[PDB]
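The methods section describes the discrete structure representation at length, but only in general terms. What matters is that the chain and its backbone geometry are given together, residue for residue. Nothing conveys this as quickly as seeing an actual entry. For illustration, here is how one protein appears when written out as sequence plus structure tokens:
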Amino acid sequence: HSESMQALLHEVDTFADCDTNVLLHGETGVGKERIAQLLHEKHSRYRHGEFVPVNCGAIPDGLFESLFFGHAAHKGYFEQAAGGTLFLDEVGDLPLYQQVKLLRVLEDGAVLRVGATAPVKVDFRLVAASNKKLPQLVKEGLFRADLYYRLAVIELSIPSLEERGAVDKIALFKSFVAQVVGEERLAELSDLPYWLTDSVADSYFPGNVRELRNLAERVGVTVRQTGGWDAARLQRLI
């Protein structure tokens, strides 16, 4: 692993087993959800609940209320994460009105389903994530200050693939390839071609770890279905 990842996983070890809100920073495909699931697993109480991941940028306005608060019948995100961890990715993509609704839930610790007269108490660990500079968005009026100040307590920055370096890239790539082909079969094949791992090291991955895993998956499939390293089919992948 790289120094950056060791420091992050160290921060995770330090701040996981408490009830404080966490804000994750990092590019898309960097592993923010996985880090959130790690915070979930490592919390002595909330581990017994469900992990509920939400992409706040992929929610049409007409469905926000139903998807978050549910219906008197549908169980919304908040109620789904009761006693567990709620993961709000793309939190900056929330419109102001939805930011307010979220804040009220965090403040009041309750949810009113659409059609109900009685609110239901909810308790979840909150992990929010963003690839934007949230303080700039607050200054610009695009993100509510009060919501930010409630969200941005524990802050973790997850480094991109380029920041993690070539050493981490290859170790991830080889790890992924092994999981796809199978380590037993990988042992019966020739060694992983030097030009291939060297290509991975010298490649930039805008889609970060997710993109790298896609490449590894495509490599692995070629390997499994041809019983070796087809230099031609592999070259087409880079």
Summary: Residues 208-226 form the longest helix (19 residues). The radius of gyration is 21 Å. The chain has two domains: 1-161, 162-238. The beta strands are 22-25, 51-55, 85-89, 110-111, 120-121, 125-130, 154-157.
